[PDB]
Amino acid sequence: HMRRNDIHTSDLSSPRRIVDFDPLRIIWGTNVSIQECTTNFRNFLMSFKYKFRKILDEREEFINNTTDEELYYIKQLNEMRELGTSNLNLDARNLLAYKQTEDLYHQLLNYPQEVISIMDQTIKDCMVSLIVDNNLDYDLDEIETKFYKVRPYNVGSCKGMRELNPNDIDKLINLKGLVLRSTPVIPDMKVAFFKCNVCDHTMAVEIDRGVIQEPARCERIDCNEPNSMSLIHNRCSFADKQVIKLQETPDFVPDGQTPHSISLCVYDELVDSCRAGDRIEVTGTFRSIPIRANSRQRVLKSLYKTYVDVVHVK
Amino acid sequence: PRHPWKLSFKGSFGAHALSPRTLTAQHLNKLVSVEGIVTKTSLVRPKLIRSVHYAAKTGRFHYRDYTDATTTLTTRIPTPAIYPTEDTEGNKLTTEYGYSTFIDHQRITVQEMPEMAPAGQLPRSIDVIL
Amino acid sequence: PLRDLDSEHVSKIVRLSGIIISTSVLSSRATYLSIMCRNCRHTTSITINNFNSITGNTVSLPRSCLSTIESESSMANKKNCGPDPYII
Amino acid sequence: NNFNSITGNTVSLPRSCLSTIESESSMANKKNCGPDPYII
Amino acid sequence: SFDRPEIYSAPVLQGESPNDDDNTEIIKSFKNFILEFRLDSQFIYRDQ
Ligand SMILES: [Zn+2]
Ligand SMILES: [Zn+2]
Numbered sequence: 001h002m003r004r005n006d007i008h009t010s011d012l013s014s015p016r017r018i019v020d021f022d023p024l025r026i027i028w029g030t031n032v033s034i035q036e037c038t039t040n041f042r043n044f045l046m047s048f049k050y051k052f053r054k055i056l057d058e059r060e061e062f063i064n065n066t067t068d069e070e071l072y073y074i075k076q077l078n079e080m081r082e083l084g085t086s087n088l089n090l091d092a093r094n095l096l097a098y099k100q101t102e103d104l105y106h107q108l109l110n111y112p113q114e115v116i117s118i119m120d121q122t123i124k125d126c127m128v129s130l131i132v133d134n135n136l137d138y139d140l141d142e143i144e145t146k147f148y149k150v151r152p153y154n155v156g157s158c159k160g161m162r163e164l165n166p167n168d169i170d171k172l173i174n175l176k177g178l179v180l181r182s183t184p185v186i187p188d189m190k191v192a193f194f195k196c197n198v199c200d201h202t203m204a205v206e207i208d209r210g211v212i213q214e215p216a217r218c219e220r221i222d223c224n225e226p227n228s229m230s231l232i233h234n235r236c237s238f239a240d241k242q243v244i245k246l247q248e249t250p251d252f253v254p255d256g257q258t259p260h261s262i263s264l265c266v267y268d269e270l271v272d273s274c275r276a277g278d279r280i281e282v283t284g285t286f287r288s289i290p291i292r293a294n295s296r297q298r299v300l301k302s303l304y305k306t307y308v309d310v311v312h313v314k
Numbered sequence: 315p316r317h318p319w320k321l322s323f324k325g326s327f328g329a330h331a332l333s334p335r336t337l338t339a340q341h342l343n344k345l346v347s348v349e350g351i352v353t354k355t356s357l358v359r360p361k362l363i364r365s366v367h368y369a370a371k372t373g374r375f376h377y378r379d380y381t382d383a384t385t386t387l388t389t390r391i392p393t394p395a396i397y398p399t400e401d402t403e404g405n406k407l408t409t410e411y412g413y414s415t416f417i418d419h420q421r422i423t424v425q426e427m428p429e430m431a432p433a434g435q436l437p438r439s440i441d442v443i444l
Numbered sequence: 445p446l447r448d449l450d451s452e453h454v455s456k457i458v459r460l461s462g463i464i465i466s467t468s469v470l471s472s473r474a475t476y477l478s479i480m481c482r483n484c485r486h487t488t489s490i491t492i493n494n495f496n497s498i499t500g501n502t503v504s505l506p507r508s509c510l511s512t513i514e515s516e517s518s519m520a521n522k523k524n525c526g527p528d529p530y531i532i
Numbered sequence: 533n534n535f536n537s538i539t540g541n542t543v544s545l546p547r548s549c550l551s552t553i554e555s556e557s558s559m560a561n562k563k564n565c566g567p568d569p570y571i572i
Numbered sequence: 573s574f575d576r577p578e579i580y581s582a583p584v585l586q587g588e589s590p591n592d593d594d595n596t597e598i599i600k601s602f603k604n605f606i607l608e609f610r611l612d613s614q615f616i617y618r619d620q
Contacts, residue, residue: 016585028584362573380521392571395485397517399576402478402487409575518574526566 004149005188005239005267006311007285008209010117030111037104037118038125044094044101045073045126052097077123077130081138086148087269088123089312092155092172109155112172112285112311119150151312153283160250161262161306164286174283175308177246179274180261187238188267194229196220203229204236240271246282246308264308273313284310323347334426335438353439354423360416367398367407375410376401384419384443420444479505479530484523486511488530505530545570 003009010017010027012034017027026033051068054060072094080088095105108115127148131138155172164173189212195202196218203219205212215229247261264282266273274280287309290300327347334350366377378398383389400407425439446460473495479488488510492503509525534542549565590597606617 019585365573389571393483393485394521394523396511396521397519397573398485398487399516400487404487404489406578407575409573411573414573516576524567527564 002239002268003147003190004120005190005241006149006151006270006309007116008113010114012117012121027111027114030107030114032107032111032114032118034114034118037107037115038122040100040104041119041122042126044098044104045077045122046071048072048094048098053091053094056093056097074130077126081127081130081143086146088148088150090119090150090152092152108152109172111170112152113170116150116152116311119152120148123150124148153281153312153314155283158251158281160252160254161248161308162257162260163250163254164306166288168286169288169306171286172283172311173286173308174281175246175248175262176250176279176281177248177262178279179276180245180247181276182242182244182272182274184242185271186241186243188241189236190239191237193232193236195232195235196223196225196228197230198225198228199223202235240268242266242271244274246280249279262306262308264310266310266313270310270313281314282308282310283312283314284308333430333438334424334440335431337438337440348424348440348442349427350424350440351427352422353425356421358418358420361419363415363417365397366410366413367401368410369401369405369407371405372401372403374401375413376407474532477532479532481509481511481525482529482531484509484511484525484529486525505532545572 018025018034019028020026024033025035048071049069050072051063054063054068073088076088079085092105092108095101095108104115124143124147127143127146128140130136131140131143152172153174155174158174158176161175190207192205192207192212192214193202194205194215199218199220199222201218201220201223203215205215214231217224217226218228242265244264244266245261246264247259249259253259264284265287285308286306288304288306290302291305293299293301323345327345330341330344330346332341332346332348334348337346337348362380364377364379366375368375376398378395380395383392398407421441421443423439424442425437428437431437446462449458449460474492475495476489476491479490480486486509488506490503490505494502505528507527509529511525512523545568547568549569551565552560592598607615609615609617
């Protein structure tokens with residue numbers, strides 16, 4: 001139980017964000033329907049062939065029989081089950097190739113936060129169904145405890161960071177760049193461990209959108225001292241977070257533009273996968289946070305700071 | 315055929331024709347003429363004198379006057395009147411730039427002229443508000 | 445009955461019969477009161493809906509000016525208005 | 533008459549108004565002028 | 573020389589499950605009692 005820190009997870013079972021518009025249920029602020037997206041991505045996983053990608057790219061004379069007619073993601077999921085791999089690398093143009101998913105591709109670009117979680121859930125469901133249907137010898141328990149995550153890439157043209165607008169925040173963007181340096185591994189708190197000072201009662205609280213709720217009183221019925229829970233910083237569990245300084249090299253440079261450098265955050269397994277000086281292609285969601293003006297005060301700056309929250313690295 | 319008239323002074327000042335080095339505290343609260351060289355000239359900044367606001371619920375225009383110790387020669391009670399974001403009845407006020415009045419304000423630094431300054435010592439300077 | 449009122453009836457609705465000796469003159473309480481700072485010229489309104497207390501001011505004028513804590517103006521023109529700076 | 537001090541106000545403005553303690557007028561018109569009410 | 577920034581709200585989601593001890597639920601129950609009470613054949617408190 002470590003979850004995914006590349007994208008903030010969403011609760012598919014919870015009807016909190018669900019609103020009905022007229023039936024058909026939509027997550028508020030999006031046009032993403034959980035059931036429709038799961039069914040569409042499941043059909044895409046069962047029925048995609050690379051000849052669809054060849055047709056989409058107007059590459060007809062290069063179509064072969066032994067590779068294009070084979071079910072692409074079925075054999076990727078088979079070899080991914082065989083090797084213990086927990087990552088699926090999804091090409092975004094393959095969604096445009098299939099007839100039922102050109103909408104989903106757009107929903108992937110506009111709302112990666114919910115759509116990527118939907119793909120993760122239906123990939124896990126397909127991972128279960130691939131051994132349920134064909135009656136494989138693998139035990140269902142190791143598949144169930146494994147948490148499967150998808151990494152979309154090739155999301156579109158590599159537009160410059162300085163050509164982006166505030167309406168592009170929390171959209172999947174793709175950038176070609178050069179790595180200059182990276183910070184050391186930073187522990188982000190994910191579960192907090194509190195112990196009562198007088199009765200040694202220990203409880204653990206999960207983080208909720210970057211905020212940890214400190215318990216004011218002891219949870220035990222016997223002990224109810226106010227202000228008795230103290231946080232032990234070493235008993236609590238952390239997650240990896242790294243910040244990489246990328247020197248962007250876009251395809252198109254406007255008149256009199258001097259190259260800039262951005263900061264991109266990688267999490268969990270993607271930490272230390274990029275060394276200084278290599279040319280890489282990063283796809284990830286475009287983020288913006290407010291920055292505290294002073295350390296002692298909570299007064300935040302009105303002008304936001306933009307960064308790239310990394311999903312996949314090529 | 316509204317602005318109040320001001321005064322300017324010329325002529326011999328006698329013992330009040332001084333220098334930034336020569337200015338001491340015995341010349342405070344006195345009219346002095348000071349010859350020097352300008353070293354710093356600050357940015358000309360507008361200073362709000364009267365702010366005019368609009369209450370859309372009552373459709374009325376209110377105003378508030380502001381003053382400080384710089385504009386007056388005689389000191390009075392410092393009464394800090396805040397910027398009115400609402401009127402007495404509690405309605406929201408929208409400020410009306412263009413109907414408010416702003417007076418240009420500058421401050422310069424007059425240092426003693428190097429021609430009559432001492433050749434080795436550090437020079438003296440004063441601040442002048444225009 | 446009035447002699448049966450115990451400490452178990454405190455802050456509880458009770459029904460009691462009796463006779464009335466005296467009815468006092470009508471005091472004037474304030475429901476909505478507008479206040480202005482003495483020198484800060486900050487205008488505030490207090491609406492009070494609890495008038496059932498006796499011998500004690502459960503709602504009073506603020507002990508200090510509320511313009512500083514609100515930070516209403518972007519200009520924000522150390523200035524202290526003083527203890528009890530509001531007039532009704 | 534003492535200006536020889538450095539880094540400290542040996543002589544400063546009074547903390548409270550001196551009209552009450554003097555009782556200079558027979559009228560003597562609770563009234564509090566506030567902390568540090570004097571201006572120069 | 574700007575004005576007061578304003579704070580306003582709008583109901584979007586359902587919220588948490590309502591509790592009978594919540595002030596809003598008590599106010600709604602009292603409103604229902606005022607509007608929907610019948611003595612014999614008429615709403616006495618609404619007409620009052
Ligand atoms: Zn305890
Ligand atoms: Zn005030």
